[PDB]
């Protein structure tokens, strides 16, 4: 019994989340700080799982183990509200997302069946320095919580959350950030996905989108057509020499928002250096040889469930887009062109940061369902979407 809307979660009882150091859904926060003090002694034993299941840390360096995690997520991870599409994170993408600088093996927390060794559960943590209003804290980002469909509704998720919390406490970290499509106590910000059609015909045949009332298929295709090459002078793929200036541009650009990452130069290399079918970053090198802007988006296809002909939807996701001399509008226009060129069906972006200044103008359509942002063990006022400056995978 999850809840997707904010007053529909008001009518729900949070058996697990009431035990956790997060503000209450009804609470209004007029303070800044930890919900509870750091614990100076941490439980040494893993939480007990139901009979027949065992903890196992996943060495994603082992190709076979990574493939098992890919399959668990491919078959059991997040679906849309209509049960028509499911995320299809690739093995190489998962390596990018789960082994950034500072990753730890015990933070790749798997659950297996004792008898068959089948992987049936997972949760992960990666370290991240997080700027939240006037405070900068070392935290973890929690992602990829997944319970096999046959194991659902058996209170396994609370055990995964408690166990990753324990393993993070053991390393001296007491705050986390995470996002979810469901409402939990208590969102620090609520964002919304918008979508930009790139291959409208594919998207309508698979019922990802639909013909708007009184608009034909030929008009819709014409409406979404794009130039074949980008417009901005000096746009080119990010290279190794660009790492310091990309770090500099991002650091200065993020100061205007209230929830942001604080990345080292090594983390900027990890998150932005282009990897085919994972992450794309283009910089603008101007007529003086200076890099003044960059755009980026990551690759995340979805399975199209129960369709005889179309099996996968190739989606691009807006990542971080920094502008200091090129208009954001022109930057995102080139991102759409580049995505189209690279074979993507759709371009997704949230309404956070300054994205609302281009969403409507570039013919994005609003999606359904939100993306809620949460902090664990940190009290602070909520913020509008335009002040969220954090994008997770």
């Amino acid at each position: 019994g999850p809840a997707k809307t904010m007053e529909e979660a008001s009518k729900r009882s949070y058996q697990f989340w009431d035990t956790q150091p997060v503000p209450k859904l009804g609470e209004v926060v007029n303070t800044h700080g930890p919900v509870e003090p750091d614990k100076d002694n941490i439980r040494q034993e893993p939480y007990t799982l139901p009979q027949g299941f065992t903890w196992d840390a996943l060495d994603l360096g082992d190709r076979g183990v990574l493939k098992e995690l890919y399959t668990l997520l491919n078959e059991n991870y997040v679906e849309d509200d209509d049960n028509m599409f499911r995320f299809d994170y690739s093995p190489e993408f998962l390596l990018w997302a789960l082994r950034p600088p500072g990753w730890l093996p015990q933070w790749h927390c798997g659950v297996r069946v004792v008898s068959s060794r089948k992987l049936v559960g997972f949760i992960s943590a990666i370290p991240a320095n997080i700027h939240i209003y006037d405070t900068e804290k070392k935290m973890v980002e929690i992602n990829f919580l997944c319970v096999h469909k046959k194991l659902r509704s058996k209170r396994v998720a609370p055990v995964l959350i408690r166990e990753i919390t324990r393993r993070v406490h053991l390393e001296g970290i007491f705050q986390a950030v995470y996002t979810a499509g469901v409402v939990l106590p208590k969102p620090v910000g609520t964002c919304r996905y918008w979508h930009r059609s790139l291959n409208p015909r594919k998207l309508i045949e698979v019922k990802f989108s639909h013909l708007s009332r009184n608009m034909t298929m030929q008009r819709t295709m014409k409406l979404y057509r794009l130039p074949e090459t980008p417009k901005t002078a000096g746009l080119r793929p990010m290279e190794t020499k660009d790492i310091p200036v990309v770090h500099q541009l991002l650091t200065r650009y993020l100061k205007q928002f209230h929830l942001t990452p604080v990345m080292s130069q090594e983390e900027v290399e990890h998150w932005f250096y282009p990897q085919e079918n994972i992450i794309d970053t283009f910089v603008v090198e101007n007529a003086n040889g200076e890099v003044t802007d960059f755009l980026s988006f990551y690759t995340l296809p979805s399975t199209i469930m129960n369709h005889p002909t179309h099996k996968s939807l190739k989606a691009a996701y807006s990542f971080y887009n920094v502008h200091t001399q090129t208009p954001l509008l022109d930057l995102m226009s080139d991102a759409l062109v580049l995505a189209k060129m690279k074979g993507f069906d759709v371009f997704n972006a949230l309404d956070l940061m300054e994205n609302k200044t281009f969403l409507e103008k570039l013919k994005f359509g609003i999606g359904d369902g939100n993306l809620q942002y949460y902090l664990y063990n940190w009290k602070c006022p909520s913020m509008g979407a335009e002040k969220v400056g954090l994008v997770l995978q």
Binding site: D80, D81, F85, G181, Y193, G365, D368
Partner: peptide, 8 residues
């Protein structure tokens, strides 16, 4: 990503 969306 985490929340699967489609145009309303």
């Amino acid at each position: 990503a985490k929340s699967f969306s489609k145009p309303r």
